Design a protein around this ligand. Structure first.
Ligand SMILES: [Cl-]
Ligand SMILES: [Cl-]
Ligand SMILES: [K+]
Ligand SMILES: [K+]
Ligand SMILES: [K+]
Ligand SMILES: [K+]
Ligand SMILES: [K+]
Ligand SMILES: [K+]
Ligand SMILES: [Mg+2]
Ligand SMILES: [Mg+2]
Ligand SMILES: [Mg+2]
Ligand SMILES: [Mg+2]
Ligand SMILES: [Mg+2]
Ligand SMILES: [Mg+2]
Lengths: 404, 404
DNA sequence: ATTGTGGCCACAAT
DNA sequence: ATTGTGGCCACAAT
DNA sequence: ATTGTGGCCACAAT
DNA sequence: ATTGTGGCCACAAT
């Protein structure tokens, strides 16, 4: 069935990390990132460490041979103390020398230091953190293998995409919703994807109170569609799907009404086709269950509007991590309705196979999973007082997966 | 997998009515009923009717050739008016001539007449009603075929039993619970089954108010176990299962406590083994759902105590009629627990294939289905003021399936 | 912060 | 007394 | 009351 | 305007 497309027109089966890695070695990734400096900084507090040298050697050989990113050099910067100012001084030194990305090794668990540095780096340059105490207790081959999937993605590469039928499913899918920081505060998100799983544009609102949810939900979605349309001016959106998720205020009927108005306003503004066909879906992870005795791709109808996708967890007991899918609004005709239901459910299943955090599928649609990654950063940068992250006006933050 | 055992040691596959009927013709039913008079009365208001003659001819040939009940004669009794007294006069005339059962043809839908006559007959002799206006608009072959399954069962025959492994599952299963007549009144039931699906003994309480539920639940169960033990004095019950069902008062923790006490008291009275292993299960029909794309026998674990059986309903859309199964109490050890879970769930699935109302399986466990049939009669005999039905003291009502 | 899952066991909840 | 949760830790993944 | 399921369509609910 | 329910009726089952 489903396969991943990598470089040189090649495709590999899903659910098979060994063949995916061998495929990258033979054919390269779907897109090799183009870089300005062809230079990466490795920033650490372990000068002359054997492990650092082994780590550097695996990184340099896999970037060249697996990712096909040629002529890269790694420069080292040593910080003298595990504190914000000392590390930041080396980050700034690396940026001053001219680098495309920073790999930053921290000595231990340190939530405030990590989120202060991470928010600074996300606002500056693609970056990848590492924990020396963890790295020193891992199979280094598996560690670096998965590390590079997400670092190459942060550099703007595309490791692999979904091989999907171009005539089925949505022109774009917008993952949208809000995530709660606490009982009162939240932020809205809206992330535009192609049906092949690649993210085109992402927007998040400022942190606001629950009372401001519906205003900022509409404005955040409008902003992401504007950004998508400016960066993809020749994209005609004739089939549009919203995936709504996140722990957010319980205003279901009011929320659906606002989301419908938003699509209608975007139609009037000619940001999507005047004849766009669209559906607004709620995607909810529900309680896991176990088949005690082929649910890969299975679709369950609970009512005309309510469905369940039996996603496998990533005693002949088969673990299922089901996904609730509710159609809360659509402009489909009765004659096309069930055809479209099948297509949107298949689409959600294909999107569940897209994950650039590592080689192994998360078995969770990227339209739900990537906002969760974003929420983890925004919440903790707020909690530990780092540098605010707002992608507006910042093309790198609007188009690259800095949340991986 | 599962098969039905019929006469002469033969067995036929489940889910295949054509082979079940051919099997009865070749080998007979599992048990042919022994009768006193070898005489059935056909009571109707259509003397010299061609249809009545066709009906009589099919009945007489199928009783002999399909059911292997030999030397039966059918006598006719004509009532002159479709009213209780006129029909009852012919019922009494038939009983006076000496008959094993009565087949009674009514002209049309008539709920008060039907339940007054039915309650009289259930208190007198095995009986089978028919509607002339329906019979005159049916394939007579299919009509009589299924008619005789339940009439032979009412005469004490055993059409077929489940072929189950004698070393797996319960020694007896007690279907118990209560059914509401209305918001205030209810009656309790308790029905003892073998694991092959055959009913050994059944008891129902008088109609009482909800305030008296737990008292009569305990007494009704005790009464059915006493009756079972007197009629099966050599039965050792070392493995016991309760299937609790019915719309009844929401007293879940109080009900479970009473059911546990009841088993313990029966242990102390040596009505079951002192070392009996038992479980008390709640069986609930839940909302149907449809697989849009092998659930025959599939078991789903929701928690250590909560399960779902995906029973098939009796667009490649597969209809499921799931059955919730909750273990509310058991004395199993941790080492035997999941082995026993599998056995009780398989058992419930096998019991879902037992139905003597007709040839086609109801796909609902007989421990739930037969109490529902009983509830329909008791409620309506109360509502339309027929003759109360209380099986206590009446061996025919305690041991035969008069509710089919 | 490469990421995960799963066993253990103290403890909370009832 | 029984059931469920959470926090460390071991270790798997190709 | 052999029993079922499924289509239709009026109507209730919102 | 849309969604779901219920009551007749056609008809299937081997
Ligand atoms: Cl349906
Ligand atoms: Cl489990
Ligand atoms: K370049
Ligand atoms: K440089
Ligand atoms: K759902
Ligand atoms: K006899
Ligand atoms: K006689
Ligand atoms: K259950
Ligand atoms: Mg608002
Ligand atoms: Mg369709
Ligand atoms: Mg990451
Ligand atoms: Mg009581
Ligand atoms: Mg076991
Ligand atoms: Mg009947």
């Amino acid at each position: 069935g489903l396969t991943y497309r990598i470089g040189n027109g090649a495709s590999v089966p899903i659910s098979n990390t060994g063949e995916l890695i061998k495929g990258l070695r033979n054919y390269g990734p779907y897109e090799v990132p183009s870089l300005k400096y062809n230079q990466i900084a490795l920033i650490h507090n372990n000068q002359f460490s054997s492990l650092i040298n082994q780590l550097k050697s695996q990184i340099s050989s896999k970037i060249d041979e697996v990712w096909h990113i040629h002529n890269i050099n790694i420069s080292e910067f040593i910080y003298d103390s595990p504190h914000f100012d000392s590390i930041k001084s080396q980050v700034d030194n690396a940026i001053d020398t001219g680098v495309d990305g920073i790999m930053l090794v921290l000595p231990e668990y340190n939530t405030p230091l990590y989120y202060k540095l991470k928010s600074y780096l996300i606002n500056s340059i693609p970056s990848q953190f590492m924990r020396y105490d963890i790295l020193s207790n891992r199979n280094l081959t598996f560690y670096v293998d998965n590390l590079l999937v997400q670092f190459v993605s942060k550099l703007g590469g595309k490791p692999w995409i979904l091989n999907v039928d171009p005539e089925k499913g949505s022109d774009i899918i917008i993952g949208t919703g809000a995530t709660r920081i606490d009982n009162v505060n939240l932020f809205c998100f809206a992330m535009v994807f192609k049906k092949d799983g690649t993210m085109l544009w992402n927007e998040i609102s400022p942190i606001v109170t629950s009372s401001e949810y519906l205003t900022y939900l509409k404005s955040t979605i409008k902003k992401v569609v504007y950004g998508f349309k400016k960066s993809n001016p020749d994209w005609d959106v004739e089939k549009l799907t919203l995936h709504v998720s996140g722990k957010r205020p319980k205003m279901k009927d009011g929320e659906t009404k606002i989301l419908k108005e938003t699509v209608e306003e975007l139609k009037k503004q000619e940001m999507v086709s005047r004849d766009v066909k669209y559906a607004i879906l709620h995607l909810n992870e529900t309680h896991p269950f176990w088949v005690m005795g082929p649910y890969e791709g299975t679709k369950v109808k609970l009512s005309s509007k309510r469905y369940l996708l039996t996603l496998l967890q990533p005693e002949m007991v088969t673990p299922i991590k089901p996904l609730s899918v509710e159609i809360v609004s659509d402009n489909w005709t009765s004659e096309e309705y069930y055809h479209n239901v099948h297509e949107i459910l298949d689409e959600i299943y294909y999107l569940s196979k897209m994950n650039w955090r590592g080689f192994r599928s998360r078995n969770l649609p990227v339209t739900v999973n990537y906002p969760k990654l974003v929420a983890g950063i925004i919440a903790n940068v707020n909690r530990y007082g780092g540098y605010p992250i707002n992608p507006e006006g910042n093309r790198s933050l609007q188009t690259n997966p800095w949340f991986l």
